[PDB]
Write a protein that holds these residues in place. Structure first.
Motif, mmCIF file in Angstrom:
data_model
loop_
_atom_site.group_PDB
_atom_site.id
_atom_site.type_symbol
_atom_site.label_atom_id
_atom_site.label_comp_id
_atom_site.label_asym_id
_atom_site.label_seq_id
_atom_site.Cartn_x
_atom_site.Cartn_y
_atom_site.Cartn_z
ATOM 1 N N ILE A 164 0.739 -1.234 0.094
ATOM 2 C CA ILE A 164 -0.160 -0.696 -0.049
ATOM 3 C C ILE A 164 0.953 1.443 -0.176
ATOM 4 N N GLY A 165 0.673 1.776 -1.072
ATOM 5 C CA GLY A 165 1.452 3.461 -1.686
ATOM 6 C C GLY A 165 3.296 3.035 -0.864
ATOM 7 N N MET A 166 4.156 2.894 -0.830
ATOM 8 C CA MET A 166 5.396 2.042 -1.639
ATOM 9 C C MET A 166 6.268 1.059 -0.901
ATOM 10 N N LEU A 190 -2.036 -2.753 -4.050
ATOM 11 C CA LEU A 190 -2.825 -2.370 -4.217
ATOM 12 C C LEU A 190 -2.231 -1.346 -5.868
ATOM 13 N N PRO A 191 -3.472 -1.097 -6.038
ATOM 14 C CA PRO A 191 -3.190 -0.390 -8.030
ATOM 15 C C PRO A 191 -2.003 0.908 -8.310
ATOM 16 N N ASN A 192 -2.021 2.126 -7.792
ATOM 17 C CA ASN A 192 -1.484 2.808 -7.307
ATOM 18 C C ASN A 192 0.087 2.990 -6.276
ATOM 19 N N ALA A 193 -0.212 1.302 -5.551
ATOM 20 C CA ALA A 193 1.787 1.316 -4.516
ATOM 21 C C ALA A 193 3.016 1.693 -5.994
ATOM 22 N N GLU A 194 3.506 1.974 -5.103
ATOM 23 C CA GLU A 194 5.255 2.545 -6.419
ATOM 24 C C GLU A 194 6.271 0.982 -5.336
ATOM 25 N N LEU A 243 8.774 0.960 -10.494
ATOM 26 C CA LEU A 243 7.637 0.082 -11.200
ATOM 27 C C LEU A 243 6.667 0.309 -10.901
ATOM 28 N N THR A 244 5.284 0.680 -11.522
ATOM 29 C CA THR A 244 3.988 0.607 -10.856
ATOM 30 C C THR A 244 3.737 -0.928 -10.409
ATOM 31 N N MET A 250 -3.955 -6.077 -6.746
ATOM 32 C CA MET A 250 -5.952 -6.087 -5.892
ATOM 33 C C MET A 250 -6.351 -4.265 -6.386
#
Ligand SMILES: [Cl-]
Ligand SMILES: [Cl-]
Ligand SMILES: [Cl-]
Ligand SMILES: [Cl-]
Ligand SMILES: [Cl-]
Ligand SMILES: [Cl-]
Ligand SMILES: [Cl-]
Lengths: 183, 192, 186, 186, 180, 179, 188, 182, 186, 187, 187
Positions: free
Chosen positions: D85-87, D107-111, D167-168, D182
């Motif tokens: 979640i997040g990074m 999660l979709p926007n995790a880095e 990476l995304t 997820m």
């Protein structure tokens, strides 16, 4: 953060103490030593027969403080299992090597250093003075020789050197008895 | 970290206090002395007959603070056993030698120093003036002479010197009665 | 460290249950307010039973010390004073202020009756109040009454840097008895 | 702020621990590692069969501290699911890739960053710690484990852990660092 | 001061009623706490609505995205209520609430300016430019408000303050709460 | 010192009796706490009155408006009681209490001066752009019954009012008499 | 470190450059910085009212009030004031760069220019009284009007651009009208 | 300690400045950049033909601050010799590569790192934001390609990697022209 | 304290610099290295033929900073005499051993330690460079060349906590002579 | 406050002006900075005149053994005689340096206090590395041997006395052999 | 603020007074203060061994050891040291005032003199090592003996007075023997 567990509210370390587990996860100073000595004495009072588990992740510290923990481990009736996770350096490795015979462990990626540095820092004014007068280095070297099965000549050379050992190299040295197998 | 014990939640030191155990694990100042004195007074109030166990790991400290603990040990009815774990220097070794006769101990690797310096830690000016009154040093020396069995002449020479003693050397000196030997497993089968 | 006792109290709270107060620091307004509150609380619990005030203090504020002094004299219970370690300045004034026949010191205690003119950190108005010459005269008058020494002798002694043993403090009249170790009682 | 939950009063993290959830939401140092190791050991003692959920939002940290968590995850009997979640950077992305096979998520926007910086990342390691890392060639061991857990060659891992690459969540899945991105549940 | 309630601190007592307060700058600690509260409320009841009150000047994009992703992941509807201010990631989270359940009090101030960032780590800043998180923010804001990507790009790059009514007309909120 | 009560800290025990104390400068932490207390009391009972005691030198317009909006939004009547001082946003909140239920103690000091500028840079920026000063003046005009022209002149001036002068102004309904 | 230069006369590096009519504006603009720059400008005019002055700019900006004090002094004095951006010119720094003498506003090739004039006082550079002054006296409109006159852009375009977070290269700043020339390397 | 020299009293760095020597011995920030730029401008004013010697022992720093030094070196008429002593990392190796062609040197034990980290810490937010405009990284890569003679593709790969080069490896790379011999 | 000398006012160190004397009396960091390098470059510019005297009283420090001084000593034309007063440990003993052949000295009670610790005088970047560039092997090779000891003996000794007297350092090859006090024989 | 002195233009501080007359003041705890400064002053004065005497005034509670040995070795190395004068106090390394002055040229003022006790650690004035060498190199035995040679007392007596907390008057220090003469108020 | 004086050479106010053989002891007496005063006294003797020195005192006192270093230097040097109390002379400050050349000890009319010598390191100006020296070497008895000799008072009276909190006017200090004259305004 150190979380709370309700069975009666304990913190994570208090809840592990209920299962006869002691965490030594920092530099060894007098406060750390007094706390560990007290937990060891408490666990013996609860049950003098049941084994104690001492987890070690320590860069070492005070020789005086370490000897207080060492003496308590040897004095008590219960067997004290030593489990290195992460690192055991200086007094940290001395305490790892001092666990019950056949019950000294380290996780696969654990790093062990037997180098016993000359001074302290952490050790106080009065502490460093005794080390050299009472030749406590010779006492440390002699105990390490007895606990690893290595000659005193080899221990003297190795405790004076900056050497890092893998958990497998530590086992071959005689500091631990087994490298913990994933199960 | 100092963990919690539930029987009712105590910290590790509070749980040991329930078993009549006191830990003197730091430099001796007024706060330390007041806490130790209060613990000694509390344990006497609980039971005036049962022994008290004073564990010592101290580099010493204030003469005034150390004499407050000494006087409390001698004033109370229970016997105060003294156990040196790690180190007992200055007032620390004076308190170790002050335990009940036959009940003063040290772990094998403990370090004892009887040198009474001429103070050191943070204290008040008047207390520092009092800590250096020549009468108290003679008083310390006289008590050490009585408690060790050594002559006052020998004590005077030794408290003025930078000397470190092993647990065995402390026993031979008369500062402790025994070096604690590890507790042997299953020593009483007919009872236990 | 201050340990916990479960019957949860801290060590001082558990001693307070047995009517024991510990004055183990320099006397300032926070210390005085806490001691005054403990004295008022103990009187409310039992107005007849004795109170035990243990003293290990280098002294402090005259104003703060007088607040404790006045509370001791105001309340119905007798306040026993026991010097452990040291009693200097307002600390030795409070030791001498205990109930008649109930002022003690342990054998190695050190007593200083010197009431410094200078000195401890207080507020501007309070420092000015601690320096009123009338209050020094009242301290001297009370010490004269409580020790049985003349005002002339008290005036000379509170102005001097003097340290007394527990036995010398007893001979002075600052305490009534030096407490004898339990090993010597038959 | 960390709120309280009454079922018995827990803080938010303690209440999640009751449901076998561990939050690794900071830089990895020895205190963080010792806490996570203790939580993992505690959950195994409660139930050795039930899965554990390790949520990761971390910029990384100490290699030694990270390896203590890694070794505990592999040692214990329960499967440890990893959720970014997040990074997840440095040791954080190493721990994400170390979760139970088929149970590593983001999660979709995790880095995700697999760059393993030369020293103790953002000053998270002690002198003693960094010294061991290049004597014991821990970088080669990290690279070998990442190669085994992602299915990438050691040559590719060596090049990528030496580079500043972000990476995304989808790119991390294609890399083999996670198993699934997820999807919002209905 | 944060008072105590006996049936908890004030925030813990509101959590019992499925209320979360986001009343500060958004950093990793704030995000981890909000994520944990959201996960806890879903575990209690996966059907009942959650109320997220916002009074925030914004903060970290990475921390803000962790909250955003958790809101979208969970089963319950997360209502968003702006009290005071919603700027930067704060306005992004306000627009992120369940459709038809995004609100603001009459005197609330909304700023959609996403600054270029004011604390966020070097590693976090580096990620945002490489992974073009600004474009992703814009794309999500565009979907959430119904505005074109071109209009969003222009407006998140500008220093602009909106009233609750202007924020409703923009599409960042669904309704201005009328005094009850 | 904040004492303990066993049936809570002093403020928690007063909260049980629907009493909120606004005794400091108004910032976001203060506003979030007051807003949460107001929301909590409404959840307990939506009909029973709330008592907001005010001793504040003022503060942030944004934080003050968050409290103002919450007072107006909730179902219960919020009584306002000035003890000590109500300046800037503090006097704005005092004037915002339920009609007929705005009070001040005899020696309370009220200042309606709304200074030009504690608030963050982002907050200060918002106030100037969104003309929040005009909104404050309009609300004060509505709540006191004074003209907007009079309010504009008075909020721009350094003026201190006694509790009685505040009642004559329309900022409070009654000066509480020792009873 | 700021070294010393001896000509039986010791100057620091900045003092020695001041002798050659060079001023360094290398920090955030606050009242102390403005007062020092104003004093250096007044001193150089007193020395020679005809010779050009060189103002070097490496600044993230700052206080509008402090920046206007520098701006007004540049316009008031008789000597032409050349502006050279080395590094960065943002907020009041880029306003000062654009205020240099006609044809004599320069930037080094890799300099970065930002015309965004932030809402407050460019990261806590202005006081409460300063922020208050700016909104009452509509200083933003004055800044925009001066930038419009000095760049040749419409006020409508300036208003949109000073409200946006935009970074310009030295070449883009020249095309905008914020500078006149991108400095050319001197060889032999 | 920084000693005094009397010829007229100078500190050690002031006395070296008299001989056209500049010491860049720290992290690169705005104060460092403004001082180095001023010293370069001063030396050009003294003599526009005589060479300048820039000694480098730097872990790098601000891209903006580093570009101000770079631009000044290229702008001025004198040849600026660059000499790495100790270390030249990030903006420090970029400035090392910026010296006059045939006049860039390194001592045998000098350590060179061309890795240009993504982020930055003492700097202002605007400066920090500017230090990560993707366009400046591309400009750094293009200049490094021109100053070393390596392809842009090779530079792009190497500036993105954590790589340490010896003085000899840096000469081989094209960042310096010669390893100074004892 | 550092007094002033007028010949023109210098501090004590500046006045010694006029006589080609440099004092290395602290831990070695980049600021110390840059100052010593600058002093060495200045003295060469004054006279490229006359000897330089480097006095050493140092517990050591940064390998990178120490190598900058070492390389400058080897690069310049003048002979650099090294004199240990007090102590020379880590990089300090390396610099002592690096002086001109036949011109390396120590006072009788000077303490020399050749132990080169693994790591806190170096930066994150400085530590990283050292193990990648195998600077330890380079240090060991230079010490082997300058003392005449084998590489294997140097490797064993730089890894150990060993203290040498001035005489033991001479026997080791780290210095050429122990400076003897004036032999006043009537 | 440390005032300025102008000789005529030429401005010195009080210590700089005394240095012109070959006077060095050791008025603080002995650490590496103090030792490096004293060593530099001694080297400078020898360069000025290798024959004329140097005057070292001592008011010091002592300090680092390593730093103290650096001063001791410099005194013995240089050609000029170094007179030692105790004003106030000389304890630990301070009393060692007082005893180390030129034979027949070691003095103390009447009310000076001398302590030969050499404490075990440093205390607190020495680093871990400094303390470590002390025991390995047995510097305590070397200090004791030098004190035995410079006072004329046996090594056995010195060993007992440096291990004890003992304070000596200027006259007792002279009788001990640490100084040659007690300075009497001059006519 | 301490201003600058240029003689036509730049001195600060204290440096300019030092040129006229004037020393200002205007603070608590510690080792740094003592070392500076001792150095100034030694410097003035070197300049002229016959001309008088003027020591102005405005001090609450301080360290016995530091005070004895100044006392011994005053008695050692050839010039007469005049002592002038301006403001206050307490503890070691009043001992130094009484230590000036016979017939040359003064106080301004409103100066306050306190002879009380506090037990410890008088206003915490003395170190543990310093406090240790004093009680072992019985420096209090030496202070009292010197004070008795310099004032003409009995040792018993001095012992009683240096142990008490007592304050004297300039006229009372003259009658006590601590000064020779109260300074009368110049005509
Ligand atoms: Cl590595
Ligand atoms: Cl939705
Ligand atoms: Cl961005
Ligand atoms: Cl070129
Ligand atoms: Cl290494
Ligand atoms: Cl020793
Ligand atoms: Cl005394």
């Amino acid at each position: 953060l150190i979380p709370t567990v309700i069975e009666r509210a304990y913190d994570i370390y208090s809840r592990l103490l209920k299962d006869r587990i002691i965490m030594l996860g920092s530099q060894i100073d007098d406060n750390v030593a007094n706390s560990i000595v007290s937990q060891l004495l408490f666990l013996q009072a609860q049950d003098s027969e049941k084994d104690i588990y001492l987890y070690i992740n320590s860069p070492g510290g005070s020789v005086t403080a370490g000897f207080a923990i060492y003496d308590t481990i040897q004095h008590i009736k219960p067997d004290v299992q030593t489990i290195c996770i992460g690192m055991a350096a200086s007094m940290g490795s001395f305490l790892l090597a001092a666990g019950a015979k056949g019950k000294r462990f380290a996780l696969p990626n654990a790093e062990v250093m037997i180098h016993q540095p000359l001074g302290g820092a952490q050790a106080t004014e009065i502490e460093i003075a005794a080390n050299h007068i009472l030749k406590t280095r010779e006492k440390l070297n002699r105990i390490l020789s007895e606990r690893t099965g290595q000659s005193i000549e080899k221990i003297q050379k190795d405790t004076d050197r900056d050497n890092f050992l893998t958990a497998e190299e530590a086992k071959e040295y005689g500091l631990i008895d087994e490298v913990m197998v994933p199960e």
